[PDB]
């Protein structure tokens, strides 16, 4: 598997009106999210900073990265939309490469990108006020993978540039409260309109039809005409 070309990525992604300020690829680390968080704790401005790892403790079989996002300027109740924005960015980046009908892939609320029912990518947001660290893990040649979906020799450098472009685009929409973000999300949602079970602490299930995602990124269920909104956590598609 060819390596990521850090210099090419910088040349492409860093520039006057670009959102990205810094980009680094490391051979190995434990967790890119932990590293950006620890950079934040030590006083660095991590807004628009990108950290990509070839392997987190098979190397080069994924794209694994974290980006920093300053959130303190955005109402706190909107911060839940960042993980959603990131999933959409990921899907949009890879949907054109895969040999499966658009129908058929999409976003499983809150944190997963699916394709033919298998997990293609996952998003993890973690907060470090005034920042959020957004982590992305995309399955390239590893659940499913680009390879398993028909991409015979995925170009990880091109895919990384696409992903980061899309991520910046959606982060801008999010910062600007652009209603197009949520519209584009719902259009690619596998959860909305589906019957779902939410398994709650204490062996309490709630079963209903997912009707919407609210302005805080929460899942709105219809339970026999009553609305139940659930905070971020796993949900089971029925």
From TrEMBL:
Transmembrane segments: none annotated. Residues 191-237 form the Biotin protein ligase C-terminal domain. Residues 48-128 form the BPL/LPL catalytic domain. Its EC number is 6.3.4.15. GO terms for cellular component: cytoplasm. One of its GO terms (molecular function) is biotin--[biotin carboxyl-carrier protein] ligase activity. It comes from the Bacteria. GO terms for biological process: post-translational protein modification. It holds the Pfam family BPL_C. Coiled coil: none annotated. InterPro entries: aa-tRNA-synth_II/BPL/LPL, Biotin_CoA_COase_ligase, BPL_C, BPL_LPL_catalytic. Keywords: Biotin, Ligase. It is an enzyme of class 6 (ligase). This is biotin--[biotin carboxyl-carrier protein] ligase. The gene is birA.
């Amino acid at each position: 598997r060819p390596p990521l070309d850090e210099r090419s990525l910088r040349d492409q992604l860093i520039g006057a009106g670009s959102g990205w300020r810094q980009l680094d690829v490391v051979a190995q680390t434990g967790s890119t999210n932990a590293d950006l968080l620890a950079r934040a704790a030590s006083g660095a401005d991590i807004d628009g900073v990108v950290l990509i790892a070839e392997h987190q403790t098979t190397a080069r079989a994924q794209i694994i990265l974290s980006v920093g996002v300053r959130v303190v300027d955005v109402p706190v109740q909107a911060w839940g939309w960042l993980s959603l924005a990131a999933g959409l960015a990921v899907l949009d980046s890879v949907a054109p490469l895969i040999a499966v009908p658009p129908a058929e892939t999409g976003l499983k609320w809150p944190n997963d990108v699916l394709a033919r029912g298998g997990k293609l990518a996952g998003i993890l947001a973690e907060v470090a006020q005034p920042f959020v660290v957004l982590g992305v893990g995309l399955n390239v040649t590893q659940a499913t993978s680009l390879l398993d979906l028909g991409v015979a020799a995925p170009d990880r450098n091109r895919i990384a540039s696409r992903l980061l472009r899309e991520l910046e685009a959606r982060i801008i929409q999010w910062r600007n409260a652009n209603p197009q973000l949520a519209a584009d999300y719902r259009a690619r949602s596998l959860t909305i309109g589906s019957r779902v079970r939410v398994e709650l602490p204490g062996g309490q299930d709630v079963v209903g039809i997912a009707r919407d995602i609210d302005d805080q990124g929460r899942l709105c269920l219809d339970v026999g005409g009553r609305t139940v909104v659930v905070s971020a956590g796993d949900v089971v598609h029925l």
